[PDB]
Design an enzyme around this catalytic site. Structure first.
Site, PDB file in Angstrom:
ATOM      1  N   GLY B  13       5.304   0.386 -39.685  1.00 11.28           N
ATOM      2  CA  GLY B  13       4.900   0.516 -41.085  1.00 11.28           C
ATOM      3  C   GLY B  13       3.867   1.603 -41.307  1.00 11.28           C
ATOM      4  N   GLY B  15       1.140   3.432 -44.571  1.00 13.47           N
ATOM      5  CA  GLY B  15       0.492   3.310 -45.877  1.00 13.47           C
ATOM      6  C   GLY B  15      -0.683   4.255 -46.033  1.00 13.47           C
ATOM      7  N   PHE B  17      -3.717   3.308 -46.081  1.00 10.52           N
ATOM      8  CA  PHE B  17      -4.628   2.829 -45.024  1.00 10.52           C
ATOM      9  C   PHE B  17      -4.393   3.496 -43.654  1.00 10.52           C
ATOM     10  CE2 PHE B  17      -1.039  -0.156 -45.155  1.00 10.52           C
ATOM     11  CZ  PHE B  17      -0.690  -0.304 -43.817  1.00 10.52           C
ATOM     12  N   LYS B  35      -2.576  -2.079 -35.529  1.00 14.26           N
ATOM     13  CA  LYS B  35      -2.934  -1.451 -36.808  1.00 14.26           C
ATOM     14  C   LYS B  35      -3.928  -0.308 -36.552  1.00 14.26           C
ATOM     15  CE  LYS B  35      -3.853  -3.845 -40.785  1.00 14.26           C
ATOM     16  NZ  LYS B  35      -4.656  -4.683 -41.714  1.00 14.26           N
ATOM     17  N   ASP B 130      -6.664 -11.800 -51.514  1.00 11.61           N
ATOM     18  CA  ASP B 130      -5.552 -10.838 -51.632  1.00 11.61           C
ATOM     19  C   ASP B 130      -4.212 -11.487 -51.267  1.00 11.61           C
ATOM     20  OD1 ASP B 130      -4.404  -8.312 -52.204  1.00 11.61           O
ATOM     21  OD2 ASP B 130      -4.632  -7.630 -50.138  1.00 11.61           O
ATOM     22  N   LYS B 132      -0.570 -12.472 -51.472  1.00  8.94           N
ATOM     23  CA  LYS B 132       0.665 -11.933 -52.036  1.00  8.94           C
ATOM     24  C   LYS B 132       1.796 -11.971 -51.017  1.00  8.94           C
ATOM     25  CE  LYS B 132      -0.928  -7.167 -51.265  1.00  8.94           C
ATOM     26  NZ  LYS B 132      -0.719  -5.783 -51.781  1.00  8.94           N
ATOM     27  N   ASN B 135       1.786  -9.762 -47.953  1.00 10.20           N
ATOM     28  CA  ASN B 135       0.752 -10.108 -46.958  1.00 10.20           C
ATOM     29  C   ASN B 135       1.102 -11.325 -46.094  1.00 10.20           C
ATOM     30  OD1 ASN B 135      -0.931  -7.927 -47.468  1.00 10.20           O
ATOM     31  ND2 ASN B 135      -2.443  -9.097 -48.656  1.00 10.20           N
TER      32      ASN B 135
HETATM   33  C1  3L0 Z   1      -0.247  -5.926 -37.662  1.00  6.51           C
HETATM   34  C2  3L0 Z   1       0.585  -7.069 -38.256  1.00  6.51           C
HETATM   35  C3  3L0 Z   1       0.496  -8.288 -37.362  1.00  6.51           C
HETATM   36  O1  3L0 Z   1      -0.543  -8.912 -37.288  1.00  6.51           O
HETATM   37  N1  3L0 Z   1       1.572  -8.684 -36.657  1.00  6.51           N
HETATM   38  N2  3L0 Z   1       2.787  -7.992 -36.724  1.00  6.51           N
HETATM   39  C4  3L0 Z   1       2.991  -7.034 -37.567  1.00  6.51           C
HETATM   40  C5  3L0 Z   1       4.338  -6.345 -37.573  1.00  6.51           C
HETATM   41  O2  3L0 Z   1       4.287  -5.106 -38.265  1.00  6.51           O
HETATM   42  C6  3L0 Z   1       3.544  -5.006 -39.393  1.00  6.51           C
HETATM   43  C7  3L0 Z   1       3.949  -4.142 -40.405  1.00  6.51           C
HETATM   44  C8  3L0 Z   1       3.199  -4.022 -41.585  1.00  6.51           C
HETATM   45  C9  3L0 Z   1       3.688  -3.083 -42.625  1.00  6.51           C
HETATM   46  C10 3L0 Z   1       4.980  -3.230 -43.151  1.00  6.51           C
HETATM   47  C11 3L0 Z   1       5.442  -2.348 -44.118  1.00  6.51           C
HETATM   48  C12 3L0 Z   1       4.631  -1.310 -44.560  1.00  6.51           C
HETATM   49  C13 3L0 Z   1       3.351  -1.150 -44.037  1.00  6.51           C
HETATM   50  C14 3L0 Z   1       2.880  -2.028 -43.071  1.00  6.51           C
HETATM   51  C15 3L0 Z   1       2.022  -4.800 -41.732  1.00  6.51           C
HETATM   52  N3  3L0 Z   1       1.174  -4.782 -42.847  1.00  6.51           N
HETATM   53  C16 3L0 Z   1       0.019  -3.871 -42.845  1.00  6.51           C
HETATM   54  C17 3L0 Z   1       1.347  -5.719 -43.974  1.00  6.51           C
HETATM   55  C18 3L0 Z   1       0.356  -6.890 -43.851  1.00  6.51           C
HETATM   56  C19 3L0 Z   1       1.346  -5.029 -45.352  1.00  6.51           C
HETATM   57  N4  3L0 Z   1       2.525  -5.816 -45.752  1.00  6.51           N
HETATM   58  C20 3L0 Z   1       3.591  -4.982 -46.339  1.00  6.51           C
HETATM   59  C21 3L0 Z   1       2.788  -6.146 -44.338  1.00  6.51           C
HETATM   60  C22 3L0 Z   1       1.630  -5.653 -40.710  1.00  6.51           C
HETATM   61  C23 3L0 Z   1       2.371  -5.775 -39.530  1.00  6.51           C
HETATM   62  N5  3L0 Z   1       1.995  -6.632 -38.464  1.00  6.51           N
END
Ligand code: 3L0
Ligand code: 3L0
Ligand code: NA
Lengths: 334, 312
Positions: B13, B15, B17, B35, B130, B132, B135
């Protein structure tokens, strides 16, 4: 060259987070098997790569003993791990105990005795089992026990050898594991005591609303023995529930000569010459009557896998997985 | 633990950020989610405290199953890295867009697990703020995982309240829009909006711009279809009560609401109830990391960021 396409999958016998177990036929030859199918991405994310390997290696030893699940062959594809097993359609002990709550003394004694032969065989080969519980004891069509799921085993435990991994099913976990001690085969005998108690009494010996309370009970609480319980059944359980491992029966003494097993000839038992006190209802070798219908109604299907995680995976993680006994080799070549 | 230890296999992913990476550790052959945040962007937006709050709340997260378990954190002279457990089920926005709306069983199950997740944070003195669909992540079995704790506020215990205008427009509480001080109540309005979207397949409050949307959140009553279960309405109507003191989740016992009648909460919290939905699609996602501001930055701004939970 052996693929799952060679097998026709008739029904799903079981399912879980680990994967699935199917009732499988080979190439329409009326020759039935049970196939535990895992996905490598699941196994990787669960951190069970070594466990899978331990399962394969222990099952290569398990051919020699009557009361362990026998494995005909193992093989892998890019996504999958398959354990091709004998098909044991008697139903497991947890299933059977949900129906009747409690096993009668002769029936519990029989199972206990056949499990002892199973465990002592493993211990003699340097294998500590560590996951002894009701639903890991499968019955065959005639009613004898078969110990299953060796993925939690520890090998090379002969001589003055110990290990240190916190593992097991919570109700069965030995106090030496909970206390952080290095341990040997002793753990299996504490678990055996828990299993025997469940067979006889119909509830667990230790209790709690969470693990912290449950583990405390295992560390501290005296097991409840009802007034109705046979005096020697109590005695064996007491002698198994000794918290100091090297004073525990099965580690010391001779568990075979305990008065509970007075009527058991152990050579005869080992040769399957003692008719089981319970014989499960089995209309055929392909019968499914003793399995839960949630699985049986759900048609057989292999899941997709995390294609990113597989391509990125270390391709030789499951090297030396493929095993093949000579009996299965003749069956395939026809 | 430096970033050079990890091999960045695929990007999960992207963004404003930064990026999320499917990272393998060197010798262990073991896979994680990383991240990666650019320090230049963090200081530009002035979300420095948020990043630190994310680390401290993630350092509490490991104890609870339905939050994202962080393994460790560390920094470089350019980037900031959170090493997280890899969750490939997809977020709930991807899933709601896949099939419009979730069924009663599936929505209730997600509603219940999120309750346990939020209530865990609230007892720790942490308001999430936050909430949603995007998230909420799902694990491979299909249990929920609450992620992105950057917008949290700590030390919110007992009588305490706070005053920050923040959140995601569709989910913002009306007391926040009125510029009032608030407590954990604000999460329970956001929970209502999330629950609404799951059952109905769109937002309760609407607008062409932010002004119109905030008005709708303040004034308009949410529409309830005739087909919607009485107890699903009853809960949503009880959640959508603009006076926080009388709101459900703050007042009464949310868990004993008839929508959760069939649920065993202690059993649920220990992952002993199987989820009604399992992800058919495995990893529904789409490699390298991309000077005056960094050198002229106060170097000690991102201090005490490093951490490692004993599970690592
Ligand atoms: C780091 C986190 C975790 O704790 N475990 N596994 C994953 C798997 O991959 C992620 C992808 C995103 C994401 C998804 C789409 C766009 C931007 C970020 C992503 N993000 C930043 C989000 C929370 C934002 N929401 C779209 C999903 C998180 C993950 N994670
Ligand atoms: C693979 C094994 C074998 O060697 N021969 N025959 C059978 C018959 O089918 C099995 C089913 C399960 C099972 C049952 C319910 C849920 C999950 C798995 C099952 N498993 C994995 C258990 C040992 C787990 N316990 C619930 C039963 C085993 C079998 N087997
Ligand atoms: Na107790």
């Amino acid at each position: 060259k052996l693929k799952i396409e060679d097998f026709e999958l008739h029904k799903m016998l079981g399912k879980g987070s680990f994967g699935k177990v199917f009732l499988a036929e080979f190439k329409k030859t009326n020759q039935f098997f049970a196939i535990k199918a895992l996905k490598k991405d699941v196994v990787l994310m669960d951190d069970d790569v070594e466990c899978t390997m331990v399962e394969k290696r222990v099952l290569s030893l398990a051919w020699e003993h009557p009361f362990l699940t026998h494995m005909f062959c193992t093989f892998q594809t890019k996504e999958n791990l398959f354990f091709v097993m004998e098909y044991l359609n008697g139903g497991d002990l947890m299933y059977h105990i949900q129906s009747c709550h409690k096993f009668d003394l002769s029936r519990a004694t029989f199972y206990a005795a056949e499990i002892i032969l199973g465990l002592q065989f493993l211990h003699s080969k340097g294998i500590v089992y560590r996951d002894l519980k009701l639903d890991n004891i499968l019955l065959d069509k005639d009613g004898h026990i078969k110990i299953a799921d060796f993925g939690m085993c520890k090998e090379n435990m002969l001589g003055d050898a110990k290990t240190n991994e916190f593992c097991g099913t919570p109700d069965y976990i030995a106090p030496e594991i909970l206390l952080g001690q290095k341990y040997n085969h002793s753990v299996d005998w504490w678990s055996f005591g828990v299993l025997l108690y469940e067979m006889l009494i119909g509830q667990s010996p230790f209790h709690g609303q969470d693990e912290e309370e449950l583990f405390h009970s295992i560390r501290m609480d005296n097991p409840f023995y009802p007034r109705w319980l046979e005096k020697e059944a109590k005695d064996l359980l007491v002698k198994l529930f000794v918290r100091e491992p090297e004073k525990r029966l099965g580690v010391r003494g001779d568990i075979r000569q305990h008065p509970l097993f007075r009527e058991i000839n152990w050579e005869e038992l080992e040769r399957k010459e003692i008719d089981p006190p319970f014989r499960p209802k089995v209309k055929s070798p392909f019968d499914c009557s003793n399995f839960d219908k949630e699985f049986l109604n759900e048609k057989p299907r292999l899941s997709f896998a995390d294609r990113a995680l597989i391509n990125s995976m270390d391709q030789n993680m499951f090297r030396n997985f493929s095993f093949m006994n000579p009996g299965m080799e003749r069956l395939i070549s026809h």
